[PDB]
């Protein structure tokens, strides 16, 4: 089975973990728990042929800067995420995440993902940004940032509503499997995860992330 490794990076609180849990299990977690590393191993069918996705979640906090690149070797595609309602997270795409990824991985494709699409029209969110002379990030603004960092695609989504969500992962797959026509991609079947919320939905005992000689590995429950 062809395997694809995808690593998700971006500022704290932009919605990386919810993106992964929502896509892989159609659930949306109930308490914000900061990530260290987590793995999701999910299968899809691309034009009727199985492909394994190895999805890696990372910590957005700067305290994990030294450790985070442990996840990077052998990555096939990065998702750099920012919240559509956090201008700071948007600027950090350029200031922090693009350089960090590119310095480690000069040739790996990047998809730029704007998250929390469901908040872009939220009155309270808009007003709070306006108090600070700011606005939610617009689609053209995200597109421009994607061009500045040489991302292969710019995509917007909500983990909460799932608008745009399948497309993020399908386009990540398409960006990797450049020889495939990839006309149709099935929803994912989660096989294993180290995230307790996601692992519980395979049932409905998480795997464990460990350091190994070869980088990060997963040990079964
Ligand atoms: N409305 C809305 N809230 C979202 C969405 N995605 C995430 N959130 C919320 O945003 C907060 C952070 O989400 P989370 O996925 O934990 O973010 P993270 O990027 O993994 N943070 P870290 O680097 O610290 O692990 C949570 O309160 C979560 O419910 C979304 O699509 N819409
Ligand atoms: Mg997280």
Numbering used by the authors: 1 to 177, 319 to 345, 353 to 369
Paper text:
One of these effectors is Plenty Of SH3s (POSH), a scaffold protein that mediates c-Jun N-terminal kinase (JNK) activation in apoptosis. Rac1 recognizes Cdc42/Rac1-interactive binding (CRIB) motifs within its effectors through a hydrophobic surface that emerges upon switch I loop closure, ensuring that only the active, GTP-bound form can engage effectors with high affinity. The Rac1-binding region of POSH has been mapped to the disordered region between its second and third SH3 domains (residues 260–445). To delineate the interaction site of Rac1, we measured 15N R1ρ relaxation rates of POSH in the absence and presence of a 45% molar ratio of Rac1 and determined the chemical shift differences between the free and bound state of POSH using 15N chemical exchange saturation transfer (CEST) experiments. These data reveal that Rac1 engages an extensive 50-residue region of POSH (residues 322–372), encompassing two distinct molecular recognition elements (MRE1 and MRE2) separated by a flexible linker.
To elucidate the structural basis of the interaction, we determined the crystal structure of Rac1 in complex with POSH at 1.25 Å resolution using a fusion construct linking the C-terminus of Rac1 to the N-terminus of POSH. The structure reveals extensive folding-upon-binding, with POSH adopting a belt-like conformation that wraps around the GTPase, burying an area of 1830 Å2 of Rac1 which corresponds to 20% of its total surface area. Consistent with the NMR and ITC data, POSH binds to Rac1 using two molecular recognition elements spanning over 50 residues, both of which are well-defined in the electron density map. MRE1 adopts an extended conformation followed by a short β-strand and an α-helix, while MRE2 forms a β-hairpin structure, in agreement with our 13C′ CEST data. Compared to previously characterized GTPase-effector complexes, POSH exhibits an entirely different fold, with the α-helix within MRE1 and the β-hairpin within MRE2 representing structural features not observed in other bound effectors. Additionally, MRE2 partially covers the Switch II region, which serves as the primary binding site for guanine nucleotide exchange factors and is a key determinant of the catalytic activity of Rac1. Notably, MRE2 also partially overlaps with MRE1, forming a backbone-backbone hydrogen bond between S355 (MRE2) and S334 (MRE1), as well as a side-chain interaction between S355 and S333 via an intercalated water molecule. These structural insights indicate that POSH stabilizes Rac1 in an active conformation and suggest that MRE2 binding requires MRE1 to adopt a folded state, with binding occurring either concurrently with, or subsequent to, MRE1 folding. MRE1 is connected to MRE2 via a flexible loop (residues 346–352) that is not well-defined in the electron density map. MRE2 adopts a β-hairpin conformation, with its interaction stabilized by hydrophobic contacts with Rac1, mediated by the side chains of V357, I359, L364, V366 of POSH.
